Each structure stands twice: as structure tokens, then as C-alpha cells.
């Protein structure tokens, strides 16, 4: 994913060796930046992936499953299906 | 739109002063490139905008309205609503 992966590894390596919390501090500064429900999704998704990296599996498991159901409501399965397919992989 | 606008002025100015048809020649080379229905949309959209620029309003009017109905099927109104809102402006 283009902007997905541009911010993904950016806040990943900001915290993988930098501070875990300094990344999440600006993550909501980037998600408060988001203006659409399309935009308000990926930030929380990649935060799930973030906290997944730190071996915090089930804190954000709920964030995976709660959004796996927040998406099937609105036909994204025929409109970017992969996006939720890897969610289906990691819920 | 990021990739939308990256290719929008890319084939706009390829034809605005260059050849009108050389742009559309590679447009389907870019849309045959498209992998998903999400991807298969924007190319035909911007082709509508292309042929709109050349004062060919109603040839592609049908391409506007036929896709305005091909989208409401799948909940994009709560998932990138603007995208189809400007379609609503130009159908």
C-alpha cells in the first residue's frame, strides 16, 4: 500500500529502535489529521500492527476484530478486498 | 487524490498539447494494469475527465452516470464519499 507503506515503515522504525511511545504520540496527530472514514481506518490499523510488533498480541487483537466487523458493514470486500484479507489473516 | 492526481495531470498534459489519442492509448495500458475493482474505477473516471476536457461532454456523460450507479451498490458513500461526490457534481 502506497501511503500505507510510506507511514508504516516510517513509524515502525521510529520506534523499533527509537521510542515506542514517541511514535504513538504522533500517530494520533496523524489520525486526527485523517478526515474521512477511509482515512480514519488505516491509522488505527497500522497502530494495531505497531503494537503487534512489540509482542502485545491480544491488546490489539480486539482492535483487529472490532474493525474486521466495522468494515464488512460497507462493501469493502468488493472494493479493496486484500486490505481486509490480511486483517482476516491477523485477527 | 494522490495517485489520482499523479496520473491525472500526467495524461492531461500528455494530450492537452500533445496527442489526444496517444494518452488514451496508454490509458488502457494503465487500466489493464489495474488489479482490483478499486483500481479498475479511477482509470475510467479520469478518462471521463480527459474526454471532458476536449469538449466531448455527453459521450462520457454516460460514463459518469453509468459509474455513479456502479458505485452506490457498494457502500463507498461511507468510504471515500468525496470521490463520488464530485461525480455527483459532473454527471
Author numbering:
A (entry chain A), B (entry chain B): 1 to 91
Paper excerpt:
The type VI secretion system (T6SS) is a membrane‐anchored contractile nanomachine used by many Gram‐negative bacteria to deliver proteins from the cytosol directly to an extracellular space or across a target cell membrane. All TssA‐like proteins harbor a conserved ImpA_N domain (PF06812) located at the N‐terminal end, while the C‐terminal part differs in its composition. The Vibrio cholerae and P. aeruginosa TssA proteins TssAVC and TssA2PA with C‐terminal VasJ domain (Class A) facilitate sheath assembly initiation and polymerization by forming a stable dodecamer at the end of the sheath that is distal from the membrane anchor. Therefore, while potentially not being strictly essential, Class A TssAs act as chaperones assisting sheath‐tube copolymerization, which likely requires assistance in proper formation of the sheath hand‐shake domain (Ge et al, 2015; Kudryashev et al, 2015; Wang et al, 2017).
To further analyze the TssA of V. cholerae, we purified the protein and used cryo‐electron microscopy (cryo‐EM) to solve its structure. To test the symmetry, an initial 3D reference was built and refined without imposing any symmetry (C1), which resulted in clear six‐pointed star reconstruction. Further refinements have been done utilizing C6 symmetry. The outer and lumenal diameters are 132 and 53 Å, and the height of the assembly is 38 Å. Molecular weight estimation from the size‐exclusion chromatography (SEC) profile is ~600 kDa, which corresponds to twelve copies of TssAVC in one oligomer (634 kDa from sequence). The model built in cryo‐EM density of TssAVC is composed of twelve C‐terminal subunits (G376‐T466, helices α8–α12) tightly packed as two interpenetrating rings, similar to A. hydrophila TssA (TssAAH), but different from head‐to‐head stacked hexameric rings of the TssAEC assembly (Zoued et al, 2016; Dix et al, 2018). Each of the C‐terminal subunits forms two interfaces with its neighbors. The first 688 Å2 PISA‐predicted interface is based on three conserved residues (W454, E455, and P456) from α11–α12 linker of one subunit and helix α10 from the neighboring subunit. Second 672 Å2 interface forms a sixfold axis between helices α9–α11 of two neighboring subunits. Our reconstruction of TssAVC CTD fits as a rigid body with CC = 0.87 into the distal end of VipA‐N3 sheath mutant reconstruction.
